[PDB]
C-alpha cells in the first residue's frame, strides 16, 4: 500500500529478471531481424514479457522532435536507453537494435543501466550483442560484448538460441516448459 | 516470425491487454497514492504486467533535461504519454499520475493512444481516471480542469485507497482488460 513495489517483489511476482539487450553491428548485419525473432521467442517460447523498441515507433513518437545534428544523434540514443531501462525496471526484457555505430553510443546506454536506482543498490543488466558479419560514420565493433553472434550462414533461430542460452547462463529467465 | 508478433498474438501470449491508466486530478487529490497501490494490486493480486511511470526515475532520467517551462511541462507530458504507449504496445498496463492540469494535456495523451498503430487498424485503450476531491480539500495544505468524460470517476473525498483502486480495477474488468482473478 504505502510505498511502491521493490525490485525483489516485482521480480518475484513477475517471475523473470529485467534487463536490456542491445544488438549492435553494421546496418546490414541483420541485427534488426534477430531482434524481432528474439522478442518473438522470448514471449512465445519462454513466456516472458519482452519488448522490442522499434526504430520507427521511436522516431515517429517519443523522439519525433529530434533531427540529425550530433547533439540530436546523442539525444536519440540517450532517450532510447532511458526507455529500455524503464522496461528493465518493470521486469521486462527491453530489446533494441537502434542505430549506434560507436562504442561510445552503447557505452553511454550501458552506463545508464549500471547507474543504480532507488529500486536497489544495483543497476540493471545491459547485454550488448555483437551481430558480426564478414566485411566481405565508421562502425565500431564492441570491445567486449556479452554475446558474439557470427551471423554468416547462420539460421536466425540458431542466432537467437545463442542469445537466449546466454540469458539462461545468467539466470535471467524462468526455466521453460 | 519474418514480420513477427502482432498485437493479437502478443495479447494472446501475454494474457492481458495493454493500456494506459492516466490518473488526473488536483495535486492533493491522493492520485499519486492511488497509482502506487494500483500498480501493487495489478502486479501482485492480478498477476499482470503493470508499470508506474511516476517518480524520480523519470524526472531525473528520461526527462532530466526538462524543467518548469510551460513548453517543458508540455514536453514532459508528451514523452510520458509516448512511453506509456510503448508499455501498452508491449501489453503492459502503464500507469501515471503526472501533473497535467488541463484537458488538452490528457487529450494529447489520449490522442496518441487512440491513433491506429502500425499494422493494427486500432489504437490502444486510454483510461482517464478522475481522482475527484473538492478544491478546498486539496488546498488544506491556470486552474485544474476536471475531465469532461473520464472512464472512471473516483469520488475520493475521505474514500479509502482500497476502495478507489477496487473501483478502478473493477472498471478494467468490465472491459476484460485483465485475465480472470486467481
Nearest-angstrom CA–CA distance, A34 and A159: 7
3-state SS class at B130: strand
Q: What does the radius of gyration of chain B's CA atoms come to, in whole angstroms? A: 16
Residues belonging to chain B with any Cβ–Cβ distance to chain A shorter than 8 Å: 1, 3-5, 9-10, 13-14, 36-37, 39-40, 43-44, 47, 49, 51-53, 55-58, 61-62, 75, 79, 82-83, 85-87, 89-92, 112, 117-118, 161-162
Query: Is residue B8 annotated as a catalytic residue, yes or no?
Result: no
Å resolution of this model?
2.0
Q: Per-residue DSSP letters for chain A?
A: --S---HHHHHHHHTS--EEEEEES-TTS-HHHHHHHHHHHHHTTS---EEE--HHHHHHTTTTT--SSHHHHHHHHHHHHHHHHHHHHTT-EEEE-----SHHHHHHHHHHHHS--TT-SS---EEEEEEE----------SS-SEEEE-SS--HHHHHHHHHHHHHHHT-S----
Sheet harboring A147-150: ordered strands across? A50-52, A93-96, A19-24, A126-132, A147-150
A85 appears as a binding residue in the annotation: no
Nearest-angstrom CA–CA distance, B62 and B43: 24
Nearest-angstrom CA–CA distance, B22 and A137: 41
A30 appears as a binding residue in the annotation: yes
Which of A83, A92, A117 has its CB closest to that of B62? Answer: A83
Options 3.40.50.300, 1.20.1250.20, 3.40.50.11540, 3.40.50.2030; CATH for B1-182 is 3.40.50.300
Options 3.40.50.300, 3.40.190.10, 1.20.140.10, 3.90.226.10; CATH for A1-177 is 3.40.50.300
CB neighbourhood size of A156 (10 A): 17
User: Out of A3, A69, A90, A100, which one is annotated catalytic?
Assistant: A100
Please, which residues bridge with residue A20 across strands?
Answer: A94, A126
Closest CA to A97 of A12, A30, A13, A144: A30
Q: Domain residues of chain B, as ranges?
A: 1-182
B172 backbone dihedrals φ, ψ, rounded to 5° = -55, -45
Q: What does the radius of gyration of chain A's CA atoms come to, in whole angstroms? A: 16
A15 Cβ neighbours under 8 A, 6+ residues apart: A48, A174
Q: Are A24 and A145 in contact (CB under 8 A)?
A: yes
Experimental method reported for this structure: X-ray
Which of A2, A36, A83 has its CB closest to that of B86? Answer: A83
Which helix (H) or strand (E) segment holds residue B153: the answer is: strand B152-155
Amino acid at each position: 500500500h504505502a510505498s511502491a513495489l521493490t525490485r525483489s517483489e516485482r521480480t518475484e511476482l513477475r517471475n523473470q529478471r529485467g534487463l536490456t539487450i542491445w544488438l549492435t553491428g553494421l546496418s546490414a548485419s541483420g541485427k534488426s531481424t534477430l531482434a524481432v525473432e528474439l522478442e518473438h521467442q522470448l514471449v512465445r517460447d519462454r513466456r516472458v514479457h519482452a519488448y522490442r523498441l522499434d526504430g520507427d515507433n521511436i522516431r515517429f513518437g517519443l523522439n519525433k522532435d529530434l533531427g540529425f545534428s550530433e547533439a540530436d544523434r546523442n539525444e536519440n540514443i540517450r532517450r532510447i536507453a532511458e526507455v529500455a531501462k524503464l522496461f528493465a525496471d518493470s521486469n521486462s526484457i527491453a530489446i533494441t537494435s537502434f542505430i549506434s555505430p560507436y562504442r561510445k553510443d552503447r557505452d553511454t546506454a550501458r552506463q545508464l543501466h549500471e547507474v543504480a536506482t532507488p529500486g536497489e543498490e544495483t543497476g540493471l543488466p545491459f547485454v550488448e550483442v555483437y551481430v558480426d558479419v564478414p566485411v566481405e560514420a565508421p562502425y565500431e565493433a564492441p570491445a567486449n560484448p556479452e554475446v558474439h553472434v557470427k551471423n554468416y550462414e547462420l539460421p536466425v533461430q540458431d542466432a537467437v538460441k545463442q542469445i537466449i542460452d546466454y540469458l539462461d547462463t545468467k539466470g535471467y529467465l524462468p526455466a521453460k516448459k
